[PDB]
Design a protein around this ligand. Structure first.
Ligand code: ZN
Ligand code: ZN
Ligand code: ZN
Ligand code: ZN
Lengths: 78, 79
């Protein structure tokens, strides 16, 4: 099966702070709109729900689901 | 950045029917629990409908697949 190499790099780092996702600090969080931002960038919007900056839908108030696809890919437990 | 190759293969195919995700037929759909199943397998579980995830027993309440979010990460990868 094919795969896009440039797109694979984009999805592994937060589109805001441009740092690569981690399991704890920059944990990839799934907004209800489907876009993914890290936990730290998500904390900035926690000062008040949360409005996604790419599509203008808002995510309600952390019981947010993790981006399980990203976490499995960057898993290096072995 | 590093990445798990075997895990990268797992996430690019439906964990139920073992078919690789596509953009239309086997479109990867995001359940509310965070797990992803293809568009075709989801119709089978919506035929018996909410939708029950077969890996974690959480339920997703939908009446049409257009209400479920796509897995934007998978779709970007296979674009
Ligand atoms: Zn970030
Ligand atoms: Zn969004
Ligand atoms: Zn399937
Ligand atoms: Zn589940």
């Amino acid at each position: 099966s094919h795969l896009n190499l440039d797109a694979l790099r984009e999805v592994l780092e937060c589109p805001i702070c441009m740092e690569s996702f981690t399991e704890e600090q920059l944990r990839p969080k799934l907004l209800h709109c489907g876009h993914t931002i890290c936990r730290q960038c998500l904390e900035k919007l926690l000062a008040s729900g949360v409005r996604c900056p790419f599509c203008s839908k808002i995510t309600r108030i952390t019981q947010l689901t993790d981006n399980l696809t990203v976490l499995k890919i960057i898993d290096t437990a072995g």
